[PDB]
Design a protein around this ligand. Structure first.
Ligand SMILES: C=CC(=O)N(C)Cc1nc(C(F)(F)F)cs1
Length: 181
C-alpha cells in the first residue's frame, strides 16, 4: 500500500548496490553526491556501485558527542549524477515506527523488501565487540544480515540496518542533522 509505495520509490531513486573489499552492501544516497553505508562496509578510495568503479572523495565514520560509534559512514562520491534529495523524509529526531519495511539491495540480494514490523528504541548496543549508540531493534531472524539495508515506514527513512543476534535485527537510527549543509 502507501508504505510500500514510498519504499519502492526510495529504492528506485536512492538505494544502490555496492561492493567493497568487505563485501556487498546496500547504499542509501541521501542527496547530491552524499551517501550513507553501515560502517562495517569500510569503503576505500574506490567503490563499486551498480557495476561501475567510483572514486570515494571523502569518508566519515560518525560518532556521537562522546565519540561512541554510530556504525554509519558518510561518503562523497566522485560523480556528476545527483541523488534525489530525501533528507525531508529523514526525521529530525530518531524515530520508532510500526509496520516498517527493510529495503536491501545488493548484487546477490537485489531489490529485496523485508517486513520487519515494529521498530523500537534500544539505544546502547555492543555490536560484535564495538560499543554503539542510538540503535533501534526489530524482529529479523537471520544470521546473515550483514549487508546494510534501509529501514522505512510510511514516508519516513528511519535507520540503516547494522546487524543482529539471529532473532532480532538492529539499525543505526537516522537523524536529519547527520546530513546537514
Ligand atoms: C546481507 C543481505 C541480507 O540481509 N541477507 C542475506 C539476509 C536476508 N535473507 C533474506 C531471505 F532471503 F531469507 F528472505 C532476506 S534478508
Amino acid at each position: 500500500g502507501p508504505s510500500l509505495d514510498f519504499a519502492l520509490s526510495l529504492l528506485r531513486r536512492n538505494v544502490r548496490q555496492v561492493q567493497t573489499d568487505q563485501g556487498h552492501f546496500t547504499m542509501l544516497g541521501v542527496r547530491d553526491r552524499l551517501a550513507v553505508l553501515p560502517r562495517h562496509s569500510q569503503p576505500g578510495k574506490t567503490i563499486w556501485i551498480e557495476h561501475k568503479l567510483v572514486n570515494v572523495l571523502d569518508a566519515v565514520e560518525l560518532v556521537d558527542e562522546q565519540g561512541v560509534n554510530l556504525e554509519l559512514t558518510l561518503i562523497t562520491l566522485d560523480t556528476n549524477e545527483k541523488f534525489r534529495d530525501i533528507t525531508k523524509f529523514i526525521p529530525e529526531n530518531i524515530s520508532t515506527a510500526s509496520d516498517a519495511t527493510l529495503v536491501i539491495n545488493t548484487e546477490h540480494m537485489p531489490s529485496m523488501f523485508v517486513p520487519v514490523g515494529d521498530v523500537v528504541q534500544y539505544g546502547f548496543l555492543n555490536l560484535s565487540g564495538k560499543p554503539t549508540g542510538r540503535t533501534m531493534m526489530y524482529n529479523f531472524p537471520t544470521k546473515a544480515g550483514q549487508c546494510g539495508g534501509v529501514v522505512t515506514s510510511v514516508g519516513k527513512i528511519i535507520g540503516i540496518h547494522i546487524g543482529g543476534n539471529g532473532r532480532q535485527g538492529f539499525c543505526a537510527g537516522l537523524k536529519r542533522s547527520y546530513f546537514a549543509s
